[PDB]
Amino acid sequence: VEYDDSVTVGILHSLTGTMAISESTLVDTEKMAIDEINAAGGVEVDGKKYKIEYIVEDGASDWPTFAEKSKKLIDQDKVPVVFGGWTSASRKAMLPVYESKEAFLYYPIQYEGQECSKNIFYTGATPNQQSEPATSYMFEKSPAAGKPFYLVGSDYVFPRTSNTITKEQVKSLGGEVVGEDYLPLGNTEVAPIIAKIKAALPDGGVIINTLNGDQNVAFFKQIQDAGITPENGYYVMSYSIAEEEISTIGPEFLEGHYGAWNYMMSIDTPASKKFAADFKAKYGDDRVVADPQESAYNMVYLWKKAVEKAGTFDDDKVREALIGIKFDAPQGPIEVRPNHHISQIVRIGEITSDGQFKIVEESDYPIDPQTWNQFEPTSKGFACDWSDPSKGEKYKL
């Protein structure tokens, strides 16, 4: 397979520290997308085929390092796009770099919304594509239907914002929140929060888990040892771990708990089966795929389609062309919306003994993403639309 020239893109993920358990597989999956596109002949611009090359930088689970590496990739390496980030902390540190330098970050991870950067595109779930339908499911259909919610997360803007939205949503459903605690990212001192869960949920109930990174390992092992188990009526709905982190922790610790995602490895379609089989072929029979990976995979194809539509790598024109791009993704059909996010089907999953999701609920159509939250009173009635100059980042409906 021959190319006429090459283009270099940036990859920026935590390959070290507390977030490497989550972000490492994103680089594996981004490289799989790149290798696929290259094997099909690369990216066509103005009658030439460009091979996609990459520069991988280690964000090291450190938000200033994410900003510093973004500066390098934009100003030194002159990439037309960076594929990166996980924590909303890492994205918030990056956002002023990509805005001030009018560059382009593609960000794949489920998050709190309340954001619509001109210089960021998003393949992760907004709350109405994850926590909102999850909250309804846990409240109405889970084995802990009608029981109170206890909220536990990492101490930064994603879990705090997610839990603000969940508290407003649970008020609107007529449910109850009986606890809300944060641990520093990476911190494994979970014993005090376990004692509070047992006192606040004496008959069991719903635990909403927004812990990010490897502190999930201690969380799931210690709740089980304390008898906070599905057998005793305790069910954890997690937003920031899926099949990769389930398989690292050990599925014995996750069986009977729940997730809410747009992609799940258990989706039984030719597209989903091909994604899983190609990942295993590239990286080993043991390796899983999952929503974070599928989100990251899609960013590379959406970028490639926007480049070919725009007829250029210029991020100014590609960011304009990207709105309205469609893709037959492993999850099903996605479309980039005026707010820079994607429409996605929503799945609720019950974790099985093998660490896969059994899909217990699925939306009937792709849900259109709301970045400005319609439950949080300070964002309700606002929206984002970058296809209309009179609307933009944040306008009143």
Binding of a copy of itself at residue 20 (CB under 8 A)?
yes
**Contact in structure between 313 and 303 (CB atoms under 8 Å):** no
- DSSP-derived pairing of the beta strands 332-336 and 342-343: antiparallel
* Whole-angstrom distance, CA of residue 14 vs CA of residue 28: 12
Rule CB under 8 A: choose which of 247, 266, 312, 363 binds a copy of itself.
247
Binding of a copy of itself at residue 191 (CB under 8 A)?
yes
DSSP 155: S
The pair of three-digit structure tokens given for residue 245, joined into one six-digit string: 């982190």
In whole angstroms, how close is the CB of 86 to a copy of itself at the nearest point? Answer: 16
Binding of a copy of itself at residue 60 (CB under 8 A)?
yes
Q: Which is nearer to a copy of itself, 249 or 310 (CB)?
A: 249
For residue 36, the Cα-to-chain-centroid distance in whole angstroms is 22
**Residue 5 near which of Ca ion, Cl ion, a copy of itself, none (CB within 5-8 Å, type-dependent):** Ca ion
Binding of a copy of itself at residue 217 (CB under 8 A)?
yes
Q: What's the farthest any 2 CA atoms get from each other in the chain? A: 67
The pair of three-digit structure tokens given for residue 298, joined into one six-digit string: 């899609």
In whole angstroms, how close is the CB of 96 to a copy of itself at the nearest point? Answer: 25
* Whole-angstrom distance, CA of residue 339 vs CA of residue 181: 32
The pair of three-digit structure tokens given for residue 278, joined into one six-digit string: 């190609």
Rule CB under 8 A: choose which of 44, 160, 167, 188 binds a copy of itself.
188
Residue nearest to Cl ion (CB): 365
Q: Which residues bind Ca ion (CB under 5 A)?
A: 5, 15, 20, 46, 102, 123, 174, 262, 295, 311-312, 315-316, 339, 370-372, 383-384
* Whole-angstrom distance, CA of residue 225 vs CA of residue 222: 5
Number of residues that bind a copy of itself (CB under 8 A): 28
DSSP 286: T
The 26-45 contact track toward a copy of itself, x by CB under 8 A, reads -x------------------
Straight-line distance from the first to the last Cα atom of the chain, in angstroms, rounded to the nearest whole number = 51
Is 99 buried (19+), middle (13-18) or exposed (0-12) by CB count in 10 A?
middle
Q: Which helix (H) or strand (E) holds 383?
A: strand 382-385
Rule CB under 5 A: choose which of 365, 378, 380, 381 binds Cl ion.
365
* Whole-angstrom distance, CA of residue 40 vs CA of residue 302: 16
Q: Which stretch binds Cl ion (CB under 5 A): 24-32, 179-187, 358-366, 368-376?
A: 358-366
**Residue 58 near which of a copy of itself, Cl ion, Ca ion, none (CB within 5-8 Å, type-dependent):** a copy of itself
**Contact in structure between 363 and 144 (CB atoms under 8 Å):** no
Binding of a copy of itself at residue 17 (CB under 8 A)?
yes
Q: Which is nearer to Ca ion, 273 or 380 (CB)?
A: 380
Binding of a copy of itself at residue 231 (CB under 8 A)?
no
User: Which single residue is written with the structure tokens 């699925």?
Assistant: 362
List interacting residues with Cl ion (CB under 5 A). Answer: 365
List interacting residues with a copy of itself (CB under 8 A). Answer: 15-18, 20, 27, 56, 58, 60-61, 186-191, 214, 217-218, 221-222, 247-250, 284-286
